Amino acid sequence: SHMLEMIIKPRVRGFICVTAHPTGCEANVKKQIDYVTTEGPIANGPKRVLVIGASTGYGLAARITAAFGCGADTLGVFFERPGEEGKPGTSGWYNSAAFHKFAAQKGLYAKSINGDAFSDEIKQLTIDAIKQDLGQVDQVIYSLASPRRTHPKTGEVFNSALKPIGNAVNLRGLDTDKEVIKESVLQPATQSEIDSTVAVMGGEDWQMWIDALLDAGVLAEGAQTTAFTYLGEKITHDIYWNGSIGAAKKDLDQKVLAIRESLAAHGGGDARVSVLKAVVTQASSAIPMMPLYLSLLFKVMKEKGTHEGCIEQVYSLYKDSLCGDSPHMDQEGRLRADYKELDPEVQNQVQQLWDQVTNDNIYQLTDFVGYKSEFLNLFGFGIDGVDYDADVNPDVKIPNLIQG
Numbered sequence: 542s543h544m545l546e547m548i549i550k551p552r553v554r555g556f557i558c559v560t561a562h563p564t565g566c567e568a569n570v571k572k573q574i575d576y577v578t579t580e581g582p583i584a585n586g587p588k589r590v591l592v593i594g595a596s597t598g599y600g601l602a603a604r605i606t607a608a609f610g611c612g613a614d615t616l617g618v619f620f621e622r623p624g625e626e627g628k629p630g631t632s633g634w635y636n637s638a639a640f641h642k643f644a645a646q647k648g649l650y651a652k653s654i655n656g657d658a659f660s661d662e663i664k665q666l667t668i669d670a671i672k673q674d675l676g677q678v679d680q681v682i683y684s685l686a687s688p689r690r691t692h693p694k695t696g697e698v699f700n701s702a703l704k705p706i707g708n709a710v711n712l713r714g715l716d717t718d719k720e721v722i723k724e725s726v727l728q729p730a731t732q733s734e735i736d737s738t739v740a741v742m743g744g745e746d747w748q749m750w751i752d753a754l755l756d757a758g759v760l761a762e763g764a765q766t767t768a769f770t771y772l773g774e775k776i777t778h779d780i781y782w783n784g785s786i787g788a789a790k791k792d793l794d795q796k797v798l799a800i801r802e803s804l805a806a807h808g809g810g811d812a813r814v815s816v817l818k819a820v821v822t823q824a825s826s827a828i829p830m831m832p833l834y835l836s837l838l839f840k841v842m843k844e845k846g847t848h849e850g851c852i853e854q855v856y857s858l859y860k861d862s863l864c865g866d867s868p869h870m871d872q873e874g875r876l877r878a879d880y881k882e883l884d885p886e887v888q889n890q891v892q893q894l895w896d897q898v899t900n901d902n903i904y905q906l907t908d909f910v911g912y913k914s915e916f917l918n919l920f921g922f923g924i925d926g927v928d929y930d931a932d933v934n935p936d937v938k939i940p941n942l943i944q945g
């Protein structure tokens with residue numbers, strides 16, 4: 542009778558929210574779109590863009606930036622769960638439904654492919670879509686965050702590890718359920734754990750993608766590809782940059798060589814690793830220390846007027862560096878968009894606060910309030926203008942969605 546609709550509220554445990562709100566996710570996507578259109582157009586951008594990991598976080602922001610900033614037709618790949626009666630879909634599903642809605646309103650092409658981007662099947666479906674619709678693509682954004690990867694050949698399942706390397710580490714953090722500041726000791730990764738992490742979050746699959754598009758002739762001349770990375774403040778180095786996930790990110794710096802080699806022989810193509818700031822996403826919230834680190838960083842950067850989320854960061858990456866006349870390069874040939882997080886004065890303040898925070902001063906020393914708000918926003922909760930009291934049909938459909 543009324544069974545087709547429901548009132549959807551957050552159900553949160555740690556860094557996991559098992560519900561998502563379709564109306565709220567739509568409004569969140571609209572907010573990011575309106576940011577881009579308010580900042581204004583970006584000149585000399587790609588007009589045909591493939592985003593791998595296009596449904597949430599930085600990849601969603603890249604899709605929105607490319608489409609509503611550069612005016613691009615966009616093809617997205619992601620791995621999300623559709624809604625069904627009584628069972629809300631994932632936020633990325635609802636985000637992507639909204640993206641298709643708003644793109645079509647603006648007369649922009651938007652097609653998506655839902656499935657495992659690590660697989661040959663999904664690469665071929667993507668190839669088929671480009672051939673049918675666009676001819677070629679000018680830019681490929683590589684923005685996957687995953688705990689696992691099934692090798693497309695051997696069928697071996699690799700699982701990522703988020704551990705330090707060498708020595709065990711005493712890592713402080715904020716338990717967001719209990720609101721306590723506490724520490725735990727993380728054991729170092731074994732060689733197998735490191736290899737598995739490089740296999741998942743390293744650059745092999747990115748390479749596989751560019752080669753497959755190349756072989757099929759659906760990569761255009763003067764095209765560009767970038768994969769997102771994080772270097773972070775020195776305080777994050779034990780768990781991130783110099784940890785197992787860092788070994789994977791370091792591999793991007795090496796794969797950006799052979800991939801760039803393949804592309805540069807193809808009409809003068811290129812590849813870069815783009816370094817971005819820490820933001821609240823499904824991925825970051827799951828990394829040890831990150832909820833505490835983000836709570837502090839948010840506070841410090843807000844004090845300086847430099848706080849940004851996904852859309853602000855990616856908009857500036859496109860405008861300043863991917864398409865801009867004065868790009869921000871480092872000594873490694875990485876594109877850097879993260880310098881405001883890495884400023885020595887910011888690092889110093891974050892470090893001082895890191896060593897002062899307790900159960901009783903969390904709200905005086907940090908922006909845990911902001912962290913919590915942004916975390917809920919990911920899932921479509923706490924958004925302006927959304928009536929959370931209203932029943933909603935969780936079964937939200939997407940036109941031009943190819944299910945793998």
Ligand SMILES: NC(=O)C1=CN([C@@H]2O[C@H](COP(=O)(O)OP(=O)(O)OC[C@H]3O[C@@H](n4cnc5c(N)ncnc54)[C@H](O)[C@@H]3O)[C@@H](O)[C@H]2O)C=CC1
Pocket residue numbers: 593594595596597598599600618619620621633656657658659683684685686687769770771816817818819820821822823824825
């Ligand atoms: N979150 C952060 O602070 C930062 C993240 N980055 C990097 O940006 C990239 C994206 O991260 P986030 O935006 O944080 O993650 P996210 O969790 O918001 O998004 C992950 C995306 O990958 C997709 N995905 C995951 N597995 C897939 C699969 N097997 N097949 C197809 N799609 C799949 C998801 O659908 C989603 O679109 C990552 O490389 C991450 O390391 C870089 C700087 C900092």
Ligand code: NA
Pocket residue numbers: 594595596597598599600601684685686
């Ligand atoms: Na992403």
